[PDB]
Amino acid sequence: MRAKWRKKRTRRLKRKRRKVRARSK
Amino acid sequence: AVGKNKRLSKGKVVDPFTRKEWFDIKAPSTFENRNVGKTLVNKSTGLKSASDALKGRVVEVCLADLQGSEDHSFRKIKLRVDEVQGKNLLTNFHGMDFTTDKLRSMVRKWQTLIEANVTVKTSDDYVLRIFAIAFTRKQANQVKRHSYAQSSHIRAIRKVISEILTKEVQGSTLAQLTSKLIPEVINKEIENATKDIFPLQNIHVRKVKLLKQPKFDVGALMALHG
Amino acid sequence: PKKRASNGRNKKGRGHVKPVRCVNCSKSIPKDKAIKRMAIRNIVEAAAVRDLSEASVYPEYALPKTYNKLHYCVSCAIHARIVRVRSREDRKNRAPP
Amino acid sequence: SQVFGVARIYASFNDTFVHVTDLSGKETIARVTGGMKVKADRDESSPYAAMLAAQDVAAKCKEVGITAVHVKIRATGGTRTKTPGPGGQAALRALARSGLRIGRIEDVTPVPSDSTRKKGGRRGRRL
Amino acid sequence: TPVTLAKVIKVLGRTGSRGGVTQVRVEFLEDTSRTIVRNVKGPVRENDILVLMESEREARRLR
RNA sequence: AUUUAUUGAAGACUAACUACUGCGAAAGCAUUUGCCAAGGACGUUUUCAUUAAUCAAGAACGAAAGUUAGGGGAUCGAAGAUGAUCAGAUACCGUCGUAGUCUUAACCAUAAACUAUGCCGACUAGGGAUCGGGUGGUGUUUUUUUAAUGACCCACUCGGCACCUUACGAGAAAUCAAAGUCUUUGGGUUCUGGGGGGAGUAUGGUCGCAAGGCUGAAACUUAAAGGAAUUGACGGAAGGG
RNA sequence: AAAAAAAAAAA
RNA sequence: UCCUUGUUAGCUCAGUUGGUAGAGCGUUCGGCUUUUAACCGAAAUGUCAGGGGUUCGAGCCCCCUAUGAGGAGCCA
RNA sequence: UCCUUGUUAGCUCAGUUGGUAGAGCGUUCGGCUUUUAACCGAAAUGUCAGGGGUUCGAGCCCCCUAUGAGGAGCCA
């Protein structure tokens, strides 16, 4: 697939992980 | 498309060219011709007073169709209606302008274009926008193919043009000015004023647009129309 | 790899060109890469010009013309049967016919 | 000797308006269109339809008494194509064959000084 | 029910995806000196004659 | 209704001139006019006298989108709503259209931010054209025949954007007047890379209102990924038959 | 300038 | 109950007392594209809402009912 | 328990007592294509939940059974 989309996907994932770790902390 | 319409009307014949009538139109005296045409309104009823609906009009016609010659063939003129007396209604100058084809033909590439504009009043309290134009021309013996300018020459040329038009207008009233335009002497003045700077072909001036009128002065309009 | 020393266009020393719009598909493209042509044409046609001059007052008038500069993009041009494609060597050639 | 009007042709893709007026343009006559002469919604702009419109406006001008016309041809202009549709020249030829007299043809297509913005987006009307 | 005659003077070539159509220029018999371009369906020659139910129309030039 | 004519308001844009043309460190910059301060090149028998080159750390500017707050809000228009198309189509096409597009005051600090070619310097083949400046010429033209200027022509030169031809040279080649002067290997200097993936991911830092940026691995996995060109085949790519 | 999706791998 | 409006082919709509009435759709066939058509040519289509009456002639003009829509109002 | 509503082609669903009842998808057949899809032509299919009755005639009308779903189950 396209790097633009892999990057977008990854950014959304980083965001989600950030907020759930915020729940923990 | 013919029978495609769903509803002609939201809520759910009289021939008027029998109700209409024609009108001869008179240009001013700064013109070789006067009888420009014919114009349509409804019968001046007791409520409408067709003279006014006829009065607030403007018409475009060519300077060649005014002076006979095909030299002033592009050169439209906008004439305003201001007065009526029995089916020979008068007109006054409302504006001049060029034709698309002529302006475009003037505009070629590999020759620098110059444009100016002034927004000046007159002796008789009119206000006008006189647009000027010019194009660099390739001298004879010239080889280099484009003949562009150096932009200080352009600033200076535009200064010259502006002060020239101001000097002429302030002193030329409106019709004195129109008869200054028709023979195209301003072009001669401009090329003589700028030849010591740069060649400058194609200096046919450009449109001129009334921005503000003074009061009516039926006296002057009558002095025009004989 | 590199197909063109000009790379598509006529930009060597600017950076930016304030583009324009291809008329057939309203598409943005720079003015240095655009295809520019110019269409100057008699208004009517060499066929009906005779009917015009016959039914015309003001004899020998002018037959004026209409002038418009046309910016097409690459795709619309090649679809409209213009600069279509050339081999390598004649791709380097730059002058018209 | 001559009674002159103003032809006001607007030739666009998808249509062709042919309508005529007095020299001032306020009192108007004989506005008719390709869709008023045919029923397709695709041949609105077609030369046959424009020609029929021209024949009809010629009939109407002759029934009024008008004999000649100065011509103002126009395309959409503004931000759109600026080039006339196919029907303009056909309408012109049609009325000139119909019998009216002709003058002062001019392209009056409204043109901007670098207008606002054109529709379709920077990537185009993709198809 | 008026018609018009014309003389085929100059045959140009074929048109159509399937090439069963011709483009020709023809001279009006009456009101001559008028030369108009038209389509044809079938076989045709020079010097020929055509019968138009309508005269004031020409087909797309393909050249 | 559309269309025509005459007007006014709004806000954006600055056409055609506009080009193998200009400026600016880059991003970028186009109506006119004026004010402010700056800058290059050229000219110089002016002055200073080695003050210089490139540079970590550290600083300024930094397209678009985006964010905050005010104004504005005409077009076009992510989202969204809709009409089609299609097996489906919340995609392509069409009609509407909030945000945004615009501006002030702040942030963000990225980009195919590309010439995908770091900067300074020297030398090496030809040819012509062009932009700015300068020089010479009983050269041409304009004025007041004349002068002086100005614009054009010829020659020359400095500095620019570039360009055409060849390859002596170089290179994997494409191609290149630098990507040459490097196995006959060294002019000075900063940055960067070490098979491909995982991964510009995780973690920890720090900057930021946020979005995110900058820095930045490991496990594990793999024998090929890849570059330039050749001959074919194929094309809802063109041309001819 | 409507439409026109897919074809196990191995050599 | 008062006034107005409509009852029409399978759906929806137009109609002058000189017509068992005209429209697009639906579908019967035929063109038409290689065809999928968008498309074009000919048919059938409406006890013209129901029943009375006037008229040389009523979807049509007069009376009534039923039906649907809108607004007005309502002493058993 | 009560009140209200439903039961129809394999699935989802339509109906004015007057046809061993109708759609779409599915299934099957032929074609197009190298092949499958899509596409084009065609077909066949139901004991209308069961049981009584009214009628000349019941998917419809009324009544019980089964099943389904919605609601009610309150004040202390």
PDB file of C-alpha atoms (C1' of nucleotides) in Angstrom, chain F residues 52-204:
ATOM      1  C1'   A F  52      38.308  35.237   5.395  1.00  0.00           C
ATOM      2  C1'   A F  53      35.837  29.766   3.925  1.00  0.00           C
ATOM      3  C1'   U F  54      32.832  26.035   5.981  1.00  0.00           C
ATOM      4  C1'   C F  55      30.745  25.178  10.588  1.00  0.00           C
ATOM      5  C1'   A F  56      28.697  21.673  16.102  1.00  0.00           C
ATOM      6  C1'   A F  57      25.850  23.755  19.974  1.00  0.00           C
ATOM      7  C1'   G F  58      22.623  28.103  19.493  1.00  0.00           C
ATOM      8  C1'   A F  59      19.476  31.571  16.435  1.00  0.00           C
ATOM      9  C1'   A F  60      15.970  34.265  12.263  1.00  0.00           C
ATOM     10  C1'   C F  61      12.613  33.283   7.948  1.00  0.00           C
ATOM     11  C1'   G F  62       9.882  29.186   6.539  1.00  0.00           C
ATOM     12  C1'   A F  63       4.256  27.057   0.635  1.00  0.00           C
ATOM     13  C1'   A F  64      -0.268  24.647   1.698  1.00  0.00           C
ATOM     14  C1'   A F  65      -3.256  22.390   5.142  1.00  0.00           C
ATOM     15  C1'   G F  66      -3.976  22.964  10.433  1.00  0.00           C
ATOM     16  C1'   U F  67      -4.901  25.473  15.641  1.00  0.00           C
ATOM     17  C1'   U F  68      -6.554  29.995  19.097  1.00  0.00           C
ATOM     18  C1'   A F  69      -9.061  34.760  19.247  1.00  0.00           C
ATOM     19  C1'   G F  70     -11.456  39.120  16.567  1.00  0.00           C
ATOM     20  C1'   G F  71     -13.223  41.061  11.738  1.00  0.00           C
ATOM     21  C1'   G F  72     -14.890  39.569   7.146  1.00  0.00           C
ATOM     22  C1'   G F  73     -17.307  36.040   4.805  1.00  0.00           C
ATOM     23  C1'   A F  74     -18.136  37.154  -3.083  1.00  0.00           C
ATOM     24  C1'   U F  75     -16.426  32.807  -5.318  1.00  0.00           C
ATOM     25  C1'   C F  76     -14.616  27.631  -4.931  1.00  0.00           C
ATOM     26  C1'   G F  77     -15.135  24.124  -1.418  1.00  0.00           C
ATOM     27  C1'   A F  78     -12.314  18.681   2.748  1.00  0.00           C
ATOM     28  C1'   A F  79     -16.872  17.034   5.912  1.00  0.00           C
ATOM     29  C1'   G F  80     -21.960  16.528   5.169  1.00  0.00           C
ATOM     30  C1'   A F  81     -26.571  16.323   2.470  1.00  0.00           C
ATOM     31  C1'   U F  82     -28.359  14.837  -2.411  1.00  0.00           C
ATOM     32  C1'   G F  83     -29.370  13.236  -8.157  1.00  0.00           C
ATOM     33  C1'   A F  84     -27.218   9.586 -11.164  1.00  0.00           C
ATOM     34  C1'   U F  85     -23.835   5.574 -12.577  1.00  0.00           C
ATOM     35  C1'   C F  86     -22.579   0.797 -11.124  1.00  0.00           C
ATOM     36  C1'   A F  87     -23.300  -6.034  -8.716  1.00  0.00           C
ATOM     37  C1'   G F  88     -22.359  -2.481  -4.813  1.00  0.00           C
ATOM     38  C1'   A F  89     -20.387   3.309  -4.903  1.00  0.00           C
ATOM     39  C1'   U F  90     -21.163   7.414   1.566  1.00  0.00           C
ATOM     40  C1'   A F  91     -15.814   7.153  -5.287  1.00  0.00           C
ATOM     41  C1'   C F  92     -15.113   9.189  -9.917  1.00  0.00           C
ATOM     42  C1'   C F  93     -19.814  13.039 -12.886  1.00  0.00           C
ATOM     43  C1'   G F  94     -23.902  16.644 -11.308  1.00  0.00           C
ATOM     44  C1'   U F  95     -26.543  20.210  -7.688  1.00  0.00           C
ATOM     45  C1'   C F  96     -26.291  22.380  -2.862  1.00  0.00           C
ATOM     46  C1'   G F  97     -23.082  23.505   0.608  1.00  0.00           C
ATOM     47  C1'   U F  98     -20.674  24.456   7.006  1.00  0.00           C
ATOM     48  C1'   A F  99     -15.209  24.733   8.036  1.00  0.00           C
ATOM     49  C1'   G F 100     -11.587  26.853   5.281  1.00  0.00           C
ATOM     50  C1'   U F 101     -10.230  29.965   1.352  1.00  0.00           C
ATOM     51  C1'   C F 102      -9.193  36.399   2.926  1.00  0.00           C
ATOM     52  C1'   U F 103      -7.062  39.772   6.885  1.00  0.00           C
ATOM     53  C1'   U F 104      -5.104  41.452  11.863  1.00  0.00           C
ATOM     54  C1'   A F 105      -2.637  39.428  16.550  1.00  0.00           C
ATOM     55  C1'   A F 106      -0.307  34.755  17.874  1.00  0.00           C
ATOM     56  C1'   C F 107       1.213  29.330  17.406  1.00  0.00           C
ATOM     57  C1'   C F 108       2.774  25.157  14.418  1.00  0.00           C
ATOM     58  C1'   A F 109       8.475  24.550  12.043  1.00  0.00           C
ATOM     59  C1'   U F 110       6.707  20.204   7.891  1.00  0.00           C
ATOM     60  C1'   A F 111       6.745  19.203   1.837  1.00  0.00           C
ATOM     61  C1'   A F 112       8.572  15.367  -4.584  1.00  0.00           C
ATOM     62  C1'   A F 113      10.461  22.443   0.968  1.00  0.00           C
ATOM     63  C1'   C F 114      13.465  19.197  -6.336  1.00  0.00           C
ATOM     64  C1'   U F 115      18.164  21.402  -9.903  1.00  0.00           C
ATOM     65  C1'   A F 116      15.943  14.741  -5.962  1.00  0.00           C
ATOM     66  C1'   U F 117      23.015  17.597  -7.542  1.00  0.00           C
ATOM     67  C1'   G F 118      25.939  21.132   0.186  1.00  0.00           C
ATOM     68  C1'   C F 119      29.162  25.699   0.364  1.00  0.00           C
ATOM     69  C1'   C F 120      33.966  28.553  -0.918  1.00  0.00           C
ATOM     70  C1'   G F 121      37.912  28.603  -4.573  1.00  0.00           C
ATOM     71  C1'   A F 122      41.048  27.426  -9.135  1.00  0.00           C
ATOM     72  C1'   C F 123      41.699  25.288 -14.149  1.00  0.00           C
ATOM     73  C1'   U F 124      39.896  22.706 -18.436  1.00  0.00           C
ATOM     74  C1'   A F 125      36.369  22.737 -25.645  1.00  0.00           C
ATOM     75  C1'   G F 126      33.685  25.204 -29.104  1.00  0.00           C
ATOM     76  C1'   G F 127      28.870  28.773 -30.622  1.00  0.00           C
ATOM     77  C1'   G F 128      25.259  32.114 -30.539  1.00  0.00           C
ATOM     78  C1'   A F 129      21.332  34.536 -28.178  1.00  0.00           C
ATOM     79  C1'   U F 130      19.364  37.151 -23.692  1.00  0.00           C
ATOM     80  C1'   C F 131      18.926  40.469 -18.686  1.00  0.00           C
ATOM     81  C1'   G F 132      21.533  44.615 -15.664  1.00  0.00           C
ATOM     82  C1'   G F 133      25.725  47.750 -15.835  1.00  0.00           C
ATOM     83  C1'   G F 134      30.078  49.769 -18.272  1.00  0.00           C
ATOM     84  C1'   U F 135      33.459  51.085 -22.724  1.00  0.00           C
ATOM     85  C1'   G F 136      34.461  52.320 -28.040  1.00  0.00           C
ATOM     86  C1'   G F 137      32.414  53.222 -32.904  1.00  0.00           C
ATOM     87  C1'   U F 138      32.298  59.895 -38.538  1.00  0.00           C
ATOM     88  C1'   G F 139      26.998  53.699 -37.345  1.00  0.00           C
ATOM     89  C1'   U F 140      20.867  54.405 -38.049  1.00  0.00           C
ATOM     90  C1'   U F 141      16.650  57.151 -36.244  1.00  0.00           C
ATOM     91  C1'   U F 142      13.961  61.068 -33.009  1.00  0.00           C
ATOM     92  C1'   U F 143      13.722  66.006 -32.015  1.00  0.00           C
ATOM     93  C1'   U F 144      15.272  72.220 -32.780  1.00  0.00           C
ATOM     94  C1'   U F 145      17.560  69.946 -40.587  1.00  0.00           C
ATOM     95  C1'   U F 146      21.178  69.844 -36.491  1.00  0.00           C
ATOM     96  C1'   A F 147      22.269  69.218 -30.846  1.00  0.00           C
ATOM     97  C1'   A F 148      22.752  66.438 -25.801  1.00  0.00           C
ATOM     98  C1'   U F 149      19.891  62.625 -24.465  1.00  0.00           C
ATOM     99  C1'   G F 150      16.681  58.451 -25.491  1.00  0.00           C
ATOM    100  C1'   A F 151      15.797  53.893 -28.467  1.00  0.00           C
ATOM    101  C1'   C F 152      18.264  50.468 -32.204  1.00  0.00           C
ATOM    102  C1'   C F 153      23.063  48.343 -34.904  1.00  0.00           C
ATOM    103  C1'   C F 154      28.240  46.619 -34.612  1.00  0.00           C
ATOM    104  C1'   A F 155      32.559  45.242 -31.514  1.00  0.00           C
ATOM    105  C1'   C F 156      34.280  44.323 -26.463  1.00  0.00           C
ATOM    106  C1'   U F 157      33.860  43.339 -21.303  1.00  0.00           C
ATOM    107  C1'   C F 158      32.065  42.069 -15.887  1.00  0.00           C
ATOM    108  C1'   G F 159      28.197  39.728 -13.421  1.00  0.00           C
ATOM    109  C1'   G F 160      23.359  36.621 -13.944  1.00  0.00           C
ATOM    110  C1'   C F 161      18.938  32.992 -15.617  1.00  0.00           C
ATOM    111  C1'   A F 162      19.777  29.617 -18.882  1.00  0.00           C
ATOM    112  C1'   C F 163      20.893  27.227 -23.621  1.00  0.00           C
ATOM    113  C1'   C F 164      22.800  24.330 -28.553  1.00  0.00           C
ATOM    114  C1'   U F 165      26.789  20.948 -30.350  1.00  0.00           C
ATOM    115  C1'   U F 166      30.871  17.243 -29.211  1.00  0.00           C
ATOM    116  C1'   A F 167      33.160  13.973 -25.502  1.00  0.00           C
ATOM    117  C1'   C F 168      39.282  14.843 -24.568  1.00  0.00           C
ATOM    118  C1'   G F 169      37.394  13.438 -19.697  1.00  0.00           C
ATOM    119  C1'   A F 170      33.638  11.054 -16.301  1.00  0.00           C
ATOM    120  C1'   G F 171      30.095   7.599 -15.127  1.00  0.00           C
ATOM    121  C1'   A F 172      26.379   1.193 -14.037  1.00  0.00           C
ATOM    122  C1'   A F 173      24.283   3.629 -17.694  1.00  0.00           C
ATOM    123  C1'   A F 174      20.609   7.179 -18.500  1.00  0.00           C
ATOM    124  C1'   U F 175      23.278  11.278 -18.913  1.00  0.00           C
ATOM    125  C1'   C F 176      26.891  15.408 -17.271  1.00  0.00           C
ATOM    126  C1'   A F 177      30.953  21.892 -19.049  1.00  0.00           C
ATOM    127  C1'   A F 178      30.225  19.355 -14.283  1.00  0.00           C
ATOM    128  C1'   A F 179      28.106  14.635 -12.176  1.00  0.00           C
ATOM    129  C1'   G F 180      35.458  16.796 -15.447  1.00  0.00           C
ATOM    130  C1'   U F 181      40.644  17.754 -13.401  1.00  0.00           C
ATOM    131  C1'   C F 182      39.712  10.633  -8.416  1.00  0.00           C
ATOM    132  C1'   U F 183      43.663   3.323  -8.391  1.00  0.00           C
ATOM    133  C1'   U F 184      48.507   8.733 -12.100  1.00  0.00           C
ATOM    134  C1'   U F 185      43.594   7.790  -6.056  1.00  0.00           C
ATOM    135  C1'   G F 186      44.932  14.299  -1.052  1.00  0.00           C
ATOM    136  C1'   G F 187      42.560  22.456  -2.609  1.00  0.00           C
ATOM    137  C1'   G F 188      39.527  23.671   2.174  1.00  0.00           C
ATOM    138  C1'   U F 189      35.139  22.211   4.755  1.00  0.00           C
ATOM    139  C1'   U F 190      29.886  20.728   7.052  1.00  0.00           C
ATOM    140  C1'   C F 191      26.118  16.991   6.802  1.00  0.00           C
ATOM    141  C1'   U F 192      24.591  12.085   5.677  1.00  0.00           C
ATOM    142  C1'   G F 193      24.490   6.409   4.403  1.00  0.00           C
ATOM    143  C1'   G F 194      26.343   0.797   5.325  1.00  0.00           C
ATOM    144  C1'   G F 195      21.372  -5.403   2.338  1.00  0.00           C
ATOM    145  C1'   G F 196      15.988  -5.272   2.608  1.00  0.00           C
ATOM    146  C1'   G F 197      11.755  -5.334   6.194  1.00  0.00           C
ATOM    147  C1'   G F 198      10.147  -4.573  11.187  1.00  0.00           C
ATOM    148  C1'   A F 199      10.531   1.224  11.734  1.00  0.00           C
ATOM    149  C1'   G F 200      10.948   6.635  11.424  1.00  0.00           C
ATOM    150  C1'   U F 201       7.566   1.650  15.061  1.00  0.00           C
ATOM    151  C1'   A F 202       8.134   1.182  20.783  1.00  0.00           C
ATOM    152  C1'   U F 203      10.205   3.503  24.992  1.00  0.00           C
ATOM    153  C1'   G F 204      12.451   7.821  27.353  1.00  0.00           C
TER     154        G F 204
END
